[PDB]
Amino acid sequence: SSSEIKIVRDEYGMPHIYANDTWHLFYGYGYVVAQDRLFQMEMARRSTQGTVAEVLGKDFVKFDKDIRRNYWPDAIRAQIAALSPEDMSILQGYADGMNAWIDKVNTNPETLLPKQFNTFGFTPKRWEPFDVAMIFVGTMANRFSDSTSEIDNLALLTALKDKYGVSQGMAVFNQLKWLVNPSAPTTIAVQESNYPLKFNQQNSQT
Amino acid sequence: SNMWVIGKSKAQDAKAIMVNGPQAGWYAPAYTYGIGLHGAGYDVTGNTPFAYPGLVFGHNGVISWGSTAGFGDDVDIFAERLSAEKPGYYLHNGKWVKMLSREETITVKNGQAETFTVWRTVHGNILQTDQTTQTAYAKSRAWDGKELASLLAWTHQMKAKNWQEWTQQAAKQALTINWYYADVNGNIGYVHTGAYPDRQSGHDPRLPVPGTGKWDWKGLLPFEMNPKVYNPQSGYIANWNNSPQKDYPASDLFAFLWGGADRVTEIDRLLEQKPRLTADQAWDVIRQTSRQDLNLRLFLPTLQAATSGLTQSDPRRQLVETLTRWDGINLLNDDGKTWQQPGSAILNVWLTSMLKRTVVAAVPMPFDKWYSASGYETTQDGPTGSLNISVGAKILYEAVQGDKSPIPQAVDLFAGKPQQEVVLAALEDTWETLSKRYGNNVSNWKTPAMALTFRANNFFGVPQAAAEETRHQAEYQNRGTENDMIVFSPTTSDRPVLAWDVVAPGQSGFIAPDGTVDKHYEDQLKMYENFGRKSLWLTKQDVEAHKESQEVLHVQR
Numbered sequence: 001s002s003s004e005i006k007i008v009r010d011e012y013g014m015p016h017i018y019a020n021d022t023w024h025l026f027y028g029y030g031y032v033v034a035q036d037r038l039f040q041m042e043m044a045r046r047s048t049q050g051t052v053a054e055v056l057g058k059d060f061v062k063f064d065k066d067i068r069r070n071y072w073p074d075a076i077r078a079q080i081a082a083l084s085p086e087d088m089s090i091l092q093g094y095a096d097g098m099n100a101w102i103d104k105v106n107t108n109p110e111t112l113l114p115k116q117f118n119t120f121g122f123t124p125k126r127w128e129p130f131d132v133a134m135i136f137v138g139t140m141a142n143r144f145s146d147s148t149s150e151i152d153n154l155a156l157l158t159a160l161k162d163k164y165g166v167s168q169g170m171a172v173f174n175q176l177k178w179l180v181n182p183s184a185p186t187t188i189a190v191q192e193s194n195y196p197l198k199f200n201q202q203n204s205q206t
Numbered sequence: 207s208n209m210w211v212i213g214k215s216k217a218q219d220a221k222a223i224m225v226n227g228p229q230a231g232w233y234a235p236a237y238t239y240g241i242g243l244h245g246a247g248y249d250v251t252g253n254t255p256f257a258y259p260g261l262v263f264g265h266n267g268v269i270s271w272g273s274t275a276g277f278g279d280d281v282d283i284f285a286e287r288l289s290a291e292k293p294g295y296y297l298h299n300g301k302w303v304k305m306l307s308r309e310e311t312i313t314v315k316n317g318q319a320e321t322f323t324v325w326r327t328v329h330g331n332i333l334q335t336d337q338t339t340q341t342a343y344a345k346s347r348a349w350d351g352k353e354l355a356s357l358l359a360w361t362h363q364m365k366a367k368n369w370q371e372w373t374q375q376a377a378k379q380a381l382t383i384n385w386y387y388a389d390v391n392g393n394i395g396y397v398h399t400g401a402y403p404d405r406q407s408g409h410d411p412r413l414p415v416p417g418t419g420k421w422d423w424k425g426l427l428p429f430e431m432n433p434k435v436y437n438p439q440s441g442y443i444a445n446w447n448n449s450p451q452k453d454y455p456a457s458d459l460f461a462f463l464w465g466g467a468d469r470v471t472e473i474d475r476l477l478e479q480k481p482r483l484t485a486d487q488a489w490d491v492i493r494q495t496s497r498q499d500l501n502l503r504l505f506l507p508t509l510q511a512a513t514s515g516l517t518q519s520d521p522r523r524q525l526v527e528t529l530t531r532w533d534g535i536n537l538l539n540d541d542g543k544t545w546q547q548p549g550s551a552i553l554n555v556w557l558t559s560m561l562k563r564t565v566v567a568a569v570p571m572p573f574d575k576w577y578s579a580s581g582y583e584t585t586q587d588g589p590t591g592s593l594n595i596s597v598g599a600k601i602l603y604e605a606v607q608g609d610k611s612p613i614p615q616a617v618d619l620f621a622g623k624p625q626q627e628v629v630l631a632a633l634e635d636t637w638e639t640l641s642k643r644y645g646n647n648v649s650n651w652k653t654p655a656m657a658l659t660f661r662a663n664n665f666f667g668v669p670q671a672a673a674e675e676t677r678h679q680a681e682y683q684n685r686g687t688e689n690d691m692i693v694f695s696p697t698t699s700d701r702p703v704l705a706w707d708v709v710a711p712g713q714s715g716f717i718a719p720d721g722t723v724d725k726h727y728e729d730q731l732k733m734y735e736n737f738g739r740k741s742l743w744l745t746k747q748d749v750e751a752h753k754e755s756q757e758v759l760h761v762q763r
């Protein structure tokens with residue numbers, strides 16, 4: 001039936017979901033995730049939205065402030081609102097599935113509540129598409145693709161230009177923090193192709 | 207994170223082999239989540255970090271996919287002009303534009319709540335640091351506004367059945383990530399995906415730019431510009447966060463470089479060593495790279511040149527001879543505490559001394575610190591992540607290469623001293639330091655090995671488990687937090703594809719209220735330790751034949 005979700009776990013506990021439409025598929029996914037890693041996901045949720053202090057206290061206030069200061073929630077929400085029905089079904093299905101399990105958990109905690117919730121003194125709550133989206137956003141994006149040290153870089157360059165003079169300073173900066181190095185081993189061989197762009201390495205923006 | 211894709215021209219007893227090892231540190235419960243999806247156009251198996259809707263490591267029986275962080279420069283900082291008379295505003299294109307702002311309140315357990323404001327401009331969120339009455343920096347991501355698209359692209363890509371369908375998805379993934387492709391026919395591919403800015407002429411992407419408007423990005427580069435290759439002549443695709451392509455610029459991080467010295471060579475070497483590799487051999491590369499000291503190969507020739515004219519009895523001489531006989535492959539002694547060979551310790555002490563004498567000596571404080579690490583630094587719990595050649599080491603490498611290096615040595619890191627002399631002085635410090643600690647008989651030196659820890663706190667430093675749930679592994683291994691391998695058209699199987707992975711500690715992180723740990727809470731921990739792996743099923747028949755449990759839900763949206 002269109003409303004059937006089969007969950008088969010293999011000999012290592014790995015779940016395989018079987019479903020007809022999108023929402024049902026990711027509902028199954030969220031269901032099993034809630035089953036296997038509920039505490040992990042709850043804390044990951046708090047990590048990515050900066051609500052760790054709410055349960056762990058004062059030592060995480062700075063961590064929380066830093067998280068919220070590194071993204072714009074409304075922008076994430078607007079992206080979700082613009083999603084087509086099919087894509088939304090993914091995040092909505094995943095959320096709903098987690099909620100189905102969470103509901104069973106908060107109904108029979110004496111047997112279903114992961115011990116950590118008891119240990120850390122709280123209980124799990126419902127998830128919305130935003131929450132699911134933010135797990136990915138908060139880890140993959142705001143953390144693994146959000147690297148820069150340009151301010152420190154300029155400090156270094158400045159210090160180098162003061163030490164070695166303007167021309168030699170710039171040149172030393174291009175010695176310690178080169179833009180490109182042609183001897184760098186590349187995943188793609190030179191016979192195949194090269195990157196066409198040439199970039200300024202004189203900080204001409206000043 | 208590493209990855210090697212072996213194509214038809216180099217695959218033995220198969221047509222394509224993909225071995226991927228994302229490295230984000232080690233955690234309990236597992237960093238990734240094993241999942242299989244079948245329906246709604248999907249038919250996949252694999253595992254994925256934090257159970258993202260889309261599988262970052264998996265296959266669909268026709269093609270397979272993986273990733274490693276790209277470390278391209280997709281982030282620039284804009285120096286915004288503020289006015290004390292116009293709080294909340296900034297100058298952009300001749301007009302004082304109102305910033306975006308929002309109130310946040312940090313609820314604090316057993317503490318007083320804390321409210322503050324977050325500020326954003328057309329360039330991105332305002333940084334907290336380096337603020338003055340007249341300046342504030344906004345961090346600009348080329349992927350800004352494309353977070354969901356990347357999430358969805360990572361999901362839809364699982365439905366691809368060929369290079370074209372797949373790259374179509376890769377073109378929508380906006381984060382700086384290396385994507386890799388392999389298929390049943392032995393085709394292999396690579397795309398350094400992501401949104402990259404089309405910068406104004408004269409823009410040095412390593413330094414901040416004024417936010418007043420004249421330096422704004424023109425827009426984003428097209429997919430055409432993204433480094434990519436399909437079925438390379440080499441017959442393989444190998445990456446360990448090294449450069450994607452000649453002339454491709456790296457992340458602006460001062461501590462990150464793509465130069466002559468790169469750990470990916472450790473992989474290239476093993477793949478070129480054999481004309482063809484089987485699945486077992488390709489898998490073995492994990493074991494080898496995880497134990498390979500990354501500095502021996504870089505500095506040994508220098509160490510040799512400097513000591514070639516010394517007498518046998520010179521201790522500096524024997525240190526190098528010790529290194530010369532070594533393959534750099536660390537192995538634990540029977541005590542499960544020390545390394546069979548003292549090479550990494552020798553290299554560490556020497557390298558540390560060389561950097562202090564060279565690079566560190568040429569850089570003004572306090573920036574000098576950035577170049578002092580040898581890359582062996584660690585705690586009692588062991589590395590929190592992968593091991594790499596340090597930035598200082600990479601800079602030093604260019605210097606010991608002399609004219610062979612394409613990087614002009616604007617300043618001599620050896621300050622007019624013969625390199626040999628500096629290298630010899632460092633060898634002397636090494637022998638002094640080590641001989642005084644381990645004695646004068648090198649052959650019985652039992653130096654500390656690094657251990658590995660599956661931490662209870664996630665990479666954010668936030669608890670994702672009780673402290674007690676931390677797991678330990680005697681031997682540190684410079685390998686993926688998880689490792690998965692897909693082999694297409696294996697000749698010894700009746701399946702058009704085979705796949706394996708390892709999700710340590712286990713699929714489940716569940717512990718019942720009474721403390722009863724789940725049956726799949728730790729059943730992959732030993733497997734991880736011994737470079738083992740378990741099968742990933744895909745077909746209905748395989749899943750059925752390996753079924754442990756079942757459950758059927760009936761629900762209406």
Ligand SMILES: O=C(O)Cc1ccccc1
Nearest residue numbers: 207228229230273274275
């Ligand atoms: O953390 C890392 O660098 C490994 C990784 C890269 C890309 C996607 C998931 C994980």
Ligand SMILES: [Ca+2]
Nearest residue numbers: 281282411458
């Ligand atoms: Ca930059």
